[PDB]
């Protein structure tokens, strides 16, 4: 209907509660492995944020996997920063991590993050 | 870190994509039954929006159920309106459905919705 009312803070509150489920390890259904590191997450949040995870979890065989191994060139800290961004909207971008974050965002197909990284690099430059 | 940047539209974009997964029936993992009607959804979105679903899906036995039957007094249209609100932030509140929506929101433990219903009822009256 065109007659709906909207609760402004709803989407933010849902995301905060999804991140609280991740903290508490509630209903997490996949482990992402990045070299020696493991990260537990919810497949639906990953698919909602990343073109790569959308492709993986819509594949008729990979949708059933409980462990996904990323390419060994992916930096675990870069992945951790992007997983935190998926669950919070906040990106911990620093001079010391920007190249790894940008490369990880390119691989995960997260264009907005790639764009801000490119802008911060261009400004320095 | 206190040095993060934030993407304003991220939470809204995640919620829109979760609702697109629900439309496409991708990764839905529970059927909610409300009398003669069935609704497919994602347990994590339900838990993030409703105190009742948080309690159900954190219970060590009920977390494994693929079907949850609601109380027969719950109106299916009222539930449909609240499920759409969970996935979109928009509440289709109308004179013809407000009592059912309020009763359903009380049962699902969705206090903000109960509050707006009470306000709209008080204004009429």
């Amino acid at each position: 209907a065109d007659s709906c009312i909207q609760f402004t803070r709803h989407a933010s509150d849902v995301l905060l509660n999804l991140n609280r489920l991740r903290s508490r390890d509630i209903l997490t259904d996949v482990v992402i492995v990045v070299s020696r590191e493991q990260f537990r997450a919810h497949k639906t949040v990953l698919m909602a944020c990343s073109g790569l995870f959308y492709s993986i979890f819509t594949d008729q065989l990979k949708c059933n996997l409980s462990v996904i191994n990323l390419d060994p060139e992916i930096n675990p800290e870069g992945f951790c920063i992007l997983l935190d961004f998926m669950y919070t909207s906040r990106l911990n971008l620093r001079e010391g991590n920007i190249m790894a974050v940008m490369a990880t965002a390119m691989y995960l197909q997260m264009e907005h993050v790639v764009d801000t990284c490119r802008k911060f690099i261009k400004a320095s430059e | 870190a206190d040095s993060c940047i934030q993407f304003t539209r991220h939470a809204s974009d995640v919620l829109l994509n979760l609702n697109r997964l629900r439309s496409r029936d991708i990764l839905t993992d529970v059927v909610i039954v409300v009398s003669r009607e069935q609704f497919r959804a994602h347990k994590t979105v339900l838990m993030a929006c409703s105190g009742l679903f948080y309690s159900i899906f954190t219970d060590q036995l009920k977390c494994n159920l693929s079907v949850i039957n609601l109380d027969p007094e719950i109106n299916p249209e009222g539930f449909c309106i609240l499920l759409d609100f969970m996935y979109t932030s928009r509440l289709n509140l109308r004179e013809g459905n407000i009592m059912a929506v309020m009763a359903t929101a009380m049962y699902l433990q969705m206090e903000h919705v109960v509050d707006t219903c009470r306000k709209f009822i008080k204004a009429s009256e």
Partner: peptide, 5 residues
Amino acid sequence: AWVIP
């Protein structure tokens, strides 16, 4: 909160 979207 609530608004007209």
